[PDB]
Amino acid sequence: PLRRISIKILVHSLFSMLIMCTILTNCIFMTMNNPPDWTKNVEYTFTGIYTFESLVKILARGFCVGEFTFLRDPWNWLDFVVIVFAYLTEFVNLGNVSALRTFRVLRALKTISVIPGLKTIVGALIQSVKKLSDVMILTVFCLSVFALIGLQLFMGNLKHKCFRNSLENNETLESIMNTLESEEDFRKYFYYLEGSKDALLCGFSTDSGQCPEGYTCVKIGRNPDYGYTSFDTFSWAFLALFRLMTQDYWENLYQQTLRAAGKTYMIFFVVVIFLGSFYLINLILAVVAMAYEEQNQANIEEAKCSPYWIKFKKCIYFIVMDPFVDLAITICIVLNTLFMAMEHHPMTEEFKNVLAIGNLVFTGIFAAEMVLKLIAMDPYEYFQVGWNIFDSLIVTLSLVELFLADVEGLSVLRSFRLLRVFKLAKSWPTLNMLIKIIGNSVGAFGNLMLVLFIIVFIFAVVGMQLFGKSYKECVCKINDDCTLPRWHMNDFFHSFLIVFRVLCGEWIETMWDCMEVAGQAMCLIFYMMVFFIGNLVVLNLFLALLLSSFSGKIWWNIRKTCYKIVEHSWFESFIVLMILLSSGALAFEDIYIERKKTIKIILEYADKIFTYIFILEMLLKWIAYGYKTYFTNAWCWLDFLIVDVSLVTLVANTLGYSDLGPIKSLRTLRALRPLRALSRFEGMRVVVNALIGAIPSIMNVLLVCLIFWLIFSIMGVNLFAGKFYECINTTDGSRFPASQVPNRSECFALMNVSQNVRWKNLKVNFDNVGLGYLSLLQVATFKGWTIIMYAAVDSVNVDKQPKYEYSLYMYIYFIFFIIFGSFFTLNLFICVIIDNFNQQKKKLGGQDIFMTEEQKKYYNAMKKLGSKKPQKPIPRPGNKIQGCIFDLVTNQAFDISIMVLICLNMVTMMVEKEGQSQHMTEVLYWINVVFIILFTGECVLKLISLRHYYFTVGWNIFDFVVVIISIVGMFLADLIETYFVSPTLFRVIRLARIGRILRLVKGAKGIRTLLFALMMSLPALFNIGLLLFLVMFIYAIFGMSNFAYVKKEDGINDMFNFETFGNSMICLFQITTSAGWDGLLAPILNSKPPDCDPKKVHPGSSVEGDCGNPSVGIFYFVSYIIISFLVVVNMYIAVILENFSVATE
Amino acid sequence: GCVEVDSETEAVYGMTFKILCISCKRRSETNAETFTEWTFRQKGTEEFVKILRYENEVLQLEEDERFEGRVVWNGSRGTKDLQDLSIFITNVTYNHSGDYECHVYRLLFFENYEHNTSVVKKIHIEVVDKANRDMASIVSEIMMYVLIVVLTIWLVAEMIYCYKKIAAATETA
Ligand SMILES: *[C@@H]1O[C@H](CO)[C@@H](O[C@@H]2O[C@H](CO)[C@@H](O)[C@H](O)[C@H]2NC(C)=O)[C@H](O)[C@H]1NC(C)=O
Ligand SMILES: CC(C)CCC[C@@H](C)[C@H]1CC[C@H]2[C@@H]3CC=C4C[C@@H](O)CC[C@]4(C)[C@H]3CC[C@]12C
Ligand SMILES: *[C@@H]1O[C@H](CO)[C@@H](O)[C@H](O)[C@H]1NC(C)=O
C-alpha cells in the first residue's frame, strides 16, 4: 500500500519538475565563493530534498528490502554516493570539506536525462571518445619520439644565461649562485631585459643569441617560465612537445629555443610543427567527424462607422502591399546601416547632429510603415508572419529608446539598433539557404551548445572550489604585487573565464600560475581533463555537425620555327633555371649588401642579363603563339606584366629618371618575379587550380560573415569608441593609479609639470568600423586579443582614465563575439570550402585534385602497397641446426619478446636527464651496448635461418638498416667525443639511437594504419608545401624591402626581424600558423613621433627613418594570414580527410 | 640598424674623401657613452701620431699641418652613443696616404655594472691622380656583353638549323 503509492508518486510528472528545479537553484548556489551563514539552512534543505528522492526511489524499487532494482541505474549509484557523502559531512567532520563539497557538482549531471535531446549528444560524445583510442596511442608514440629528439638536442640549452664576467670581492659563479635568492639579486649578476622575469638566453654558436659586451654566456640557474619550460627531462620535454602540438603559445618556445641553441635548429620546429601538429590535429578532427557521420547515417536508417474603416483597410492594403514598398524598406535598412556605421570617436558635433536627424528620419519611416501595415491586416493574422513580429519588436525597442528621458548609462539600447540588419535575410538567396542548412538539424546545435555550457559550468565550479583559496593564499608567487592576476580562479566568473580560454586553446600560462600556486599534479590533471573534454572532443563535434549538414609563306615558316623552338624541352629547362637564378638574386639583397660590394655589382649586371633573356622569350612567344593566343592566356599575361614592369624600371634607370618618387616603388615590385615559377611547376599549378574553383563560394560566405562582423563591429564602436586612451608612465609603461589622474585634463597637467607622461591610445582599438574590423580579427584569431580585452573591461568613459576591471562584465561581449563570429564563421568557411572541393572531385570524376599525373601513378602504387594478400612461407632449411633456429625465430614468442625488448630500450632512453651523475652515464651506456648486442644477434639469427629471403621483406630491410645505423652511430659518437671536438655533431650523431624506437610500429596495428595514411598523403602535402614556399619567398622579399629599418618593439627584436632572408623566413614560418602576427604588426603600425622617428640615420646605410606604413603593414599581414589559412589549414584538412577514409577502408 | 661597413681605400687628389669607421654594439638596446681617437702613419714613416679626438659633441684637432682646416666630422650627431665614427677630408692631398687607426672607447651601463670596451679599426688609404674603376666592375661589364652575344648567337643558330630542317620537311608532304 505505502510502497505502491510511493511508486505512483515516483512515476508522477511533478517529480522531475521539482527535482530539476532544485538542482538548478543548487547549481546557482554553488557559485558563491564566500557564502553567508543563512546559506546553511537551504543547504540542509537541498540535502533533505535529495534524501527524500532517494527514500522514495528506495520504497518504490524496493518491492523487497533487498533493494534489487534501485542499484541497477548508474545514475542511482551517483545519487547514492552523493547522499552518503553529504551525510558523512553532516554526521562527522574529517577535514576535507572543500574536497567533500567538490563532489556534489556531479548533481548537475542529472540534467542530461530530463531533456531528451541531451542523451543523443552525450551518446555522440561517448562514441567519439571510444574511437579516439588509436589516435591517442599514435599521439603518445609520436610525441614520445619527438620528445626524445628534443631532449637529445636541447638537453641543457634553456639554462643559458649572461653572466657578469667581472666579479669584485674575489668571488666565483658557485659563491654567487649559493647566495642569490630573488630576482632583484639575480639582476645584479645576470643580464635581464627591461620588464622581464627571466634572464635573457644566449648561445655559444655564431647564429644564436648574443650575450652583450661585458657578459659571458654560461649554463647555470633555472629554466624560464618558473622552470616549467625545459628539455632537461623526458617529462618536461613531453610537456613542451604537447604544447608544440596544440600550438599554444608555441612561438615563445620557438624564440627561446632559437636564441639558446641557434637559428639553424628551426628545422626541428618546422618538421615538428608541420608533420606533428597538423597531421595529428587533423587526424583527431577526421576521426571525430567520421564517427559522427557513421552514427548519423545509422540513426537515419533506423528512424526510417465600422464599414468606413473597413474600406480604409482595403485601400491601405492595396496601397501598402505593392512590391515597391518592400524594396524601398530594404533600401532604408541599407541606408540606416551605412549611416550608423559612420560613427567614430573624434566626431564633430555637426556630424553627430547629422546622424541624430538621420536616426529620427529612419525610425520614423520604420514605425510609420509598421503602423500602415498593421492597420490593414488583422493582428491575429499580422502576427502569423515570423519576420513581422521581429519588425514590431524592433519598432518597440526603437520607440522606447527614442522617447525615454535621456540617460547617459543606457548605451545597451543604443547598441540594440543594429538588429535591423538581419531583415536583409528576407531576400538574400545564400543566407536563406544557410539558415535552412542549420534549420534541418538545429536541434543538434542547440543540444551541443547546452552540453558545452553545462561542461564549462561544472569545470568552473570545480576549479573555483579546488584552486580558489590557493590563488589568494599564495597570491604573490604569481604576481609581484601580492594581488590577484588578471586570470585566476578565486571567483566564479574568473574561473569560468579561465575554462573558456582553455576552450579557446590557451592553457599553458594560466596553468603555469596554477601549478605555481597549487601544486603540479592537481593543476595538470584538471587542465588536461578540461582540454581533452572541451577542445579535442566537443569543439570538434561542432565542426563535424557543420560538415555533415553540408552533405608570304616564309612568314609562316618563321612562325612554325619559333613555335618549335619555344615548345622544346631544353628551352623550358633553361627558362626555369633563369627564373630560379633571378629569384635567388633577389634573395641576396639584405641590409648588409653594402659590405658585399662585389656581389652587388654582379647582381646589378645580372639583372640586365635576365631582363634581356625574358624579353627575348616574350618576343619568341609572340611570334610563335600569336597575339590572340598569347593574350587569351592568364599565365602569359602574368609574365607579360612582370616583363613590362622590369623594362619600365630599366628604362627609367637608363634615362637617369631614377631616384624618383613613384619609380622607387616600382623596385618593390621586383619581389613579384618569383611568380613566374607558378606557371612552370605542375604542383603549384594544380594547387592553385584547386583554390581558384572555390573562390565563387568563398565570396558569398565572406559576404555573409562581413555583414555579421559589421554588426559586431558597430556594437563595439558604440561600446568602446575613444575609451581606450590611458595616461601612462613611459619609463616603465604603467597606467597611472587612476586616483592621481582621474581624467585627460589632469594627465595633460602632469605632462606639463612632469616629463615621461603620455596620454596614449591603443594601436588596434575600436575607434571606427575600419579599426573595429582589425580588432575583431585579432579577437577571432586569439592573437593580441587579451590586450584589447583588458582595456575593454577597464574602460570608464571617453576622456576618463581607465580603472581596473571597472567594466568587468564587458567580457560577455567578447564571449558572444567569439562564439558566433570566430567559431561559427571559421567553421562555416572550412565546411563551404571542403564541400566545394568535394564538388570539384565529383565533377572531375573521382580524381584527386591535389596530385599531378606522375604523383597519381605513384599514389596508386602506394595504395596497392597497403592492401596486400598473404605471401608464400619461407621454406624450412634442413641442416638440423638451421631448422631449429628457424623454429625458434619464426615463433610468435620471438617477435613478442623483441617488442618488449624494444619497449625496455625506449624506457632506458627515457631515463636520461640533465645533470645525471657519471655512474648513471656509464650504466646507461652499457645497457645500451647490451641492447645493441641483442638486436644485432637477432639480425644475425634471422640471417642464418631465413637465409637470403630476409631482404624480401620491407620491414626486415628496415631492421637491418637500423642495426647498421646503431652500430655506426655508437662507434662514431665515441670517436667524435674522444678524438674530435664537436658536442653538437656528437648529439646529432647520437640521434641514431632513435631508429631502434621507430622499429616498434612493426607490431602495432593502429599506428601502422595511421602512418600508412600519412605516407599516402605525402605527395599532396609536398605540392601544398611547394606553393607555400613560393608564397613565403615572395612575402619574404617584400618584407625585406619594406620592413627593415623598423623600431624593433613588440615582436621585432635583434633575432626575429625583416633584415635578412633567414630572419624574414623565420618570422613568416612563425606566422604561417597565425602565431604572433599582432606582435609583428604592432611596430609597423606606428608612423609619426613620438611613436617613431622619420629622421633616423641608421649608420652603415642611407635609409632614413624607422617606422613603417600602416596601410602596407596591415595589407601585408592580413593577406598573409588569410592566404596561409586558405592554403595550409583547409587543404591540409581536405587531404587528411580523404586519405583517412582511404586508409581505414 | 647598425651595419659595419669598411672604408674605401682610394682617394683622388684635389677632391673630397670620407673615411668610414663603424663599430656596432653587440646588443642595440644597450646604453653607452663612446668617444673616439684617430691616429695615422704616413707611408714611408713608422709612427702613429694622434690627429683628432671626438668626445661629447665636440671635435678636437691637433696642430699637424697635414689636416688643419680640412677635416670635419661625419659620424653620429647629438647622441653620445656613437656607433659611427667616420671622417671627412675636404681637399685631399698627397700627404693623406698611409695607415689610419680609429680607436673606439665605449662605456656600457648595466644594472649595477659598468664596462669599459675598446675596439681598434685599421684603415689604409692611398691617394691617386685619377679614379680607376674596380676590377669587378670592369670584368662584369665584359662578361655581360659576352653573355648577351653568346645567347644571341645560340638563338640565331637554333633558328637557322630549325628553319632549314622544317623547310626541307615541307617538300615531303
Ligand atoms: C614614472 O616612473 C618612474 C619609474 O618607473 C618614476 O621615477 C622614479 O621616481 C622615484 C621618486 O621617489 C625614484 O625613487 C625612483 O628611483 C624613480 N625611478 C626611476 C627608474 O628613475 C617617475 O617618477 C614616474 N613619473 C611620474 C610622473 O610619476
Ligand atoms: C579623425 C577622424 C575624423 C577619422 C575617422 C574618419 C571616418 C569618417 C572613417 C574612418 C573609417 C571609415 C569606415 C571604414 C569602413 C566602413 C565599412 C563600410 O562598409 C561602410 C563605411 C565605413 C564604416 C567607413 C566610413 C567612414 C569611416 C568611419
Ligand atoms: C675607462 O673608462 C675611464 C672612465 O671611466 C676612462 O678614463 C678610460 O680611458 C677608459 N679606458 C680606456 C682604455 O680608455
Side-chain angles (χ1 to χ4, degrees), chain A residues 160-164 189-191 200 202 211-212 215-218:
Chain A
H160 292 176
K161 284 153 191 43
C162 313
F163 184 60
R164 264 201 41 180
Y189 293 82
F190 294 109
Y191 183 68
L200 171 83
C202 77
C211 256
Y215 283 90
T216 181
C217 159
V218 55

Side-chain angles (χ1 to χ4, degrees), chain A residues 338 341-344 346-347 351 710 768-771 773:
Chain A
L338 271 43
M342 281 195 328
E343 201 205 318
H344 52 267
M347 197 162 38
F351 204 112
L710 172 63
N768 54 57
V769 175
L771 272 173
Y773 264 100

Side-chain angles (χ1 to χ4, degrees), chain A residues 510-754:
Chain A
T510 51
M511 191 185 88
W512 291 328
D513 283 358
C514 185
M515 321 205 278
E516 191 85 340
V517 75
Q520 293 184 50
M522 281 205 288
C523 275
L524 271 163
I525 288 184
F526 183 61
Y527 273 80
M528 282 315 147
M529 271 175 28
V530 165
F531 193 80
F532 184 50
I533 288 284
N535 224 317
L536 291 183
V537 175
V538 165
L539 291 203
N540 274 297
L541 261 173
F542 184 14
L543 182 43
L545 271 43
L546 261 173
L547 261 173
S548 76
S549 286
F550 274 90
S551 166
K553 294 312 161 213
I554 307 85
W555 170 258
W556 211 238
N557 314 107
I558 278 164
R559 264 192 91 231
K560 294 143 150 63
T561 311
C562 275
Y563 184 101
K564 287 172 150 298
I565 288 184
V566 185
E567 291 296 81
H568 203 306
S569 166
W570 290 18
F571 193 100
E572 301 176 330
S573 306
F574 174 70
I575 288 294
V576 185
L577 172 83
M578 301 305 98
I579 278 164
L580 311 163
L581 281 173
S582 306
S583 306
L586 291 173
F588 263 71
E589 281 156 49
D590 313 318
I591 68 154
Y592 294 110
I593 198 54
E594 281 325 319
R595 304 151 51 61
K596 294 162 281 143
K597 274 132 191 183
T598 311
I599 318 164
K600 164 202 281 283
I601 298 154
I602 317 174
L603 321 173
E604 271 205 39
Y605 283 118
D607 213 38
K608 284 172 241 193
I609 288 294
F610 294 121
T611 311
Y612 193 60
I613 278 154
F614 284 128
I615 288 184
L616 261 173
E617 171 206 40
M618 191 185 58
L619 271 43
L620 261 53
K621 284 172 131 63
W622 280 358
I623 318 294
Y625 294 170
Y627 283 89
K628 174 202 321 163
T629 311
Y630 184 81
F631 293 111
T632 292
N633 184 357
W635 300 128
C636 275
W637 260 88
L638 191 83
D639 303 358
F640 173 80
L641 301 153
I642 308 154
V643 184
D644 293 338
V645 165
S646 56
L647 181 73
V648 165
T649 311
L650 171 153
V651 165
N653 304 317
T654 291
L655 291 203
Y657 284 90
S658 166
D659 213 318
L660 181 53
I663 288 284
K664 234 172 161 183
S665 306
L666 277 296
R667 284 191 91 261
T668 61
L669 271 193
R670 274 161 81 270
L672 271 193
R673 314 211 300 241
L675 262 183
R676 314 181 221 221
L678 271 183
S679 166
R680 304 301 200 300
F681 294 110
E682 191 176 9
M684 321 176 258
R685 274 211 330 271
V686 305
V687 165
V688 165
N689 294 337
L691 261 183
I692 288 294
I695 298 314
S697 46
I698 288 145
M699 291 295 108
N700 314 337
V701 185
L702 171 63
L703 202 63
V704 165
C705 314
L706 281 193
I707 298 314
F708 264 100
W709 281 47
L710 172 63
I711 308 174
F712 273 111
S713 166
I714 288 144
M715 221 185 308
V717 165
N718 274 17
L719 291 173
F720 304 124
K723 284 152 181 213
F724 293 0
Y725 284 71
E726 51 206 350
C727 176
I728 48 184
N729 183 307
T730 51
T731 311
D732 53 297
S734 76
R735 194 201 291 150
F736 264 119
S739 86
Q740 193 184 350
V741 304
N743 44 17
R744 154 171 181 131
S745 306
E746 320 295 336
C747 166
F748 283 161
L750 211 53
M751 321 205 308
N752 175 347
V753 165
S754 166

Side-chain angles (χ1 to χ4, degrees), chain A residues 608-609 612 616, chain B residues 143-153:
Chain A
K608 284 172 241 193
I609 288 294
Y612 193 60
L616 261 173
Chain B
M143 291 285 248
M144 181 205 48
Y145 283 130
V146 305
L147 271 193
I148 288 164
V149 295
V150 165
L151 301 153
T152 311
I153 288 284

Side-chain angles (χ1 to χ4, degrees), chain B residues 32-112:
Chain B
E33 311 176 330
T34 311
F35 73 110
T36 292
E37 281 255 20
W38 289 77
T39 51
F40 163 90
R41 95 161 171 270
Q42 213 174 20
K43 64 162 41 183
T45 311
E46 81 286 41
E47 201 45 79
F48 284 62
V49 295
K50 195 172 121 183
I51 68 164
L52 71 84
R53 164 181 210 181
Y54 184 92
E55 189 173 12
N56 297 152
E57 285 170 45
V58 75
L59 201 163
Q60 273 154 270
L61 271 163
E62 311 266 350
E63 71 305 350
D64 63 338
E65 51 196 340
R66 274 131 60 191
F67 284 110
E68 301 285 30
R70 64 151 41 91
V71 185
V72 305
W73 161 268
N74 283 57
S76 286
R77 304 271 220 181
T79 292
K80 204 182 231 193
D81 173 327
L82 291 203
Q83 292 214 350
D84 164 12
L85 262 63
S86 306
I87 288 294
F88 203 80
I89 308 164
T90 81
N91 213 307
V92 175
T93 181
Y94 283 111
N95 284 337
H96 303 137
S97 46
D99 303 287
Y100 283 100
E101 271 186 350
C102 165
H103 303 167
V104 185
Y105 304 111
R106 184 161 311 190
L107 191 83
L108 301 103
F109 303 120
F110 294 120
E111 291 266 20
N112 184 7

